């Protein structure tokens, strides 16, 4: 029990790096900034209030994984006479995290890290946590290009209608930025991308 | 509405928990299947004419252990078998083995290995059998 | 006739199919489940096929009366244990009267003395150690 008091503290002090690297918070916190850089804004709204709502949004679909490890580890059979059977028991607890990671990581990259099927044995937890984070940053970049794309058109069309007239020495950022955000509030794009971001992992 | 002329269970990609609950009526007792032994799957046309003989054959083909303690039928897979050796101070093996027969827990498939008049014996089996044998043998020496 | 046709099976699913022709369940370890086998096998003499396969693949096994534990060769451990008031001969009579005597891995030591040397599977040595140290405290 006394050594488990270390590992219980050791999760807690390491939580803001595991939550920094092993969940979908990186995808939410990354797309919520490039939507500001897409709109041509710098400090609006913040880096704090965008991380707060990205934290709660990532806390929804992540809580049941964290919840089952409690009810699994509250049970009375943590007393085992064998060393390896307890090592099996703690291996049997982390399968909620392993099944979460394999769903969103690449099998070839985790096979690469494994070198340095999966039904008989699960791959190790350190062999795929970077492969998960490196897959999320790539997929967030790919989805970041898509919602970047329609605001380029409003950036181009008003610069071409100003060049259609003779006024070529006129900065179009003071005119496009009004037309930029009405495209985002008539779409009501905030309430719908958070929907499909939730639906990307949690089914209805 | 349900056309088959026989009497049996058709399983299409079951999960070994909805399967054994269908046999939980022909067996007169409820069946409890563990978590690691519920990840395997079964499909096919079955027929429970006698379940205590069907369950022995499927527990050897799938790779499983089971135990009936008078009220329920616990089912685990073969990778969960725990074993332990325990010693007794002032009760012999021949006196402890009559407690199991008079209670109704003497399992002839997982017997107790040991010398006939000693303190030590070797027990192995399902976890519901092991945590019953170790406790019911320890709580008889504190009484004596 | 019976038989099994293995195609890239994972050595846990291979010995589970032999758990009907053998009359006991088989418990294969975690490190020993990485090797693979393929080919046509015929189960009609299983206790002669288990030893021949266990020497060519490299494995150790031990049947104790309830199951057949199967490890690989790199997990064999060993120990030396001193008894103060009981000798080796009646402890061997405890193993012969109980049914745990394994003639492939016997006990090495002087016949009526306190010290001896044990080597075998990890489910064998933790039983012989715990049964030997729980007879001195009773005596």
């Amino acid at each position: 029990n006394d050594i488990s008091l270390i590992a219980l503290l050791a999760f807690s002090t390491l939580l803001p790096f595991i939550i920094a690297s092993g969940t979908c918070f990186v995808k939410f916190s990354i797309v919520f900034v490039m939507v500001r850089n897409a709109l041509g804004l710098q400090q609006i709204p913040s880096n704090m209030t965008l991380n707060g709502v990205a934290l709660l949004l990532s806390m929804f679909v992540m809580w049941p994984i964290m919840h089952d490890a409690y009810v699994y580890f509250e049970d009375e059979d943590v007393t085992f006479n064998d060393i390896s059977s307890l090592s099996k028991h703690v291996d049997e607890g982390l399968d909620g995290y392993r099944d979460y990671l394999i769903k969103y990581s690449d099998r070839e990259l985790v096979q690469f890290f494994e070198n340095a099927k999966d039904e008989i044995e699960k791959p190790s937890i350190f062999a795929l946590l970077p492969a998960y984070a490196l897959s999320e940053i790539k997929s967030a970049f790919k989805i970041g290009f898509y919602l970047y794309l329609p605001f380029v058109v409003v950036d181009l069309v008003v610069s071409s209608v100003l060049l259609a007239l003779g006024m070529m020495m006129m900065s179009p950022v003071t005119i496009s930025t009004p037309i930029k955000l009405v495209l985002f509030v008539a779409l009501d794009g905030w309430t719908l991308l958070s929907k499909g971001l939730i639906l990307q992992y949690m089914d209805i | 509405k349900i056309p088959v002329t026989g009497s049996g269970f058709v399983a299409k990609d079951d999960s070994l928990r909805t399967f054994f609950d269908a046999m939980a009526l022909q067996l007169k007792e409820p069946v409890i299947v563990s978590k690691m032994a519920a990840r395997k799957k079964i499909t096919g046309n079955f027929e429970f004419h006698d379940p205590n003989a069907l369950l022995e054959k499927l527990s050897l083909q799938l790779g499983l252990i089971w135990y009936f303690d008078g009220q329920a039928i616990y089912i685990y897979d073969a990778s969960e078998m725990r074993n332990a050796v325990v010693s007794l101070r002032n009760v012999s093996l021949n006196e402890f083995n009559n407690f199991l027969k008079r209670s109704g827990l003497y399992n002839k498939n997982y017997p107790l290995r040991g010398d006939n008049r000693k303190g030590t014996f070797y027990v192995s089996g399902p976890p519901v059998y092991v945590d019953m044998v170790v406790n019911a043998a320890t709580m008889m020496d504190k009484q004596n | 006739g019976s038989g099994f046709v293995a195609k890239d099976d994972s050595l846990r699913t291979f010995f589970d199919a032999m758990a009907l022709q053998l009359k006991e369940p088989v418990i294969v370890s975690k490190m020993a489940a990485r090797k693979k086998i393929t080919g046509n096998f015929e189960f009609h003499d299983p206790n002669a096929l288990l030893e021949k396969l266990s020497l060519q693949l490299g494995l150790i096994w031990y049947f104790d009366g309830q199951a057949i534990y199967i490890y690989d060769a790199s997990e064999m451990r060993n120990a030396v244990v001193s008894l103060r008031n009981v000798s080796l001969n009646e402890f061997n009579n405890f193993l012969k009267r109980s049914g745990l005597y394994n003639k492939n891995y016997p006990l090495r030591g002087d016949n009526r003395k306190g010290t001896f040397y044990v080597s075998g599977p990890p489910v064998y040595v933790d039983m012989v150690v715990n049964a030997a140290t729980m007879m001195d405290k009773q005596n």
Binding site: - | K40, K41, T43 | G1, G3, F4, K7
Partner: peptide, 28 residues
């Protein structure tokens, strides 16, 4: 026949559709 599946033949047959899946047709 039984394309790449491992099976156990003769009078009590089963096909292993996966490492954790058993199928019980006619005795192969």
């Amino acid at each position: 026949w039984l394309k790449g599946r491992s099976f156990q033949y003769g009078a009590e047959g089963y096909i292993k559709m996966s490492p954790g899946h058993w199928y019980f047709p006619s005795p192969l």
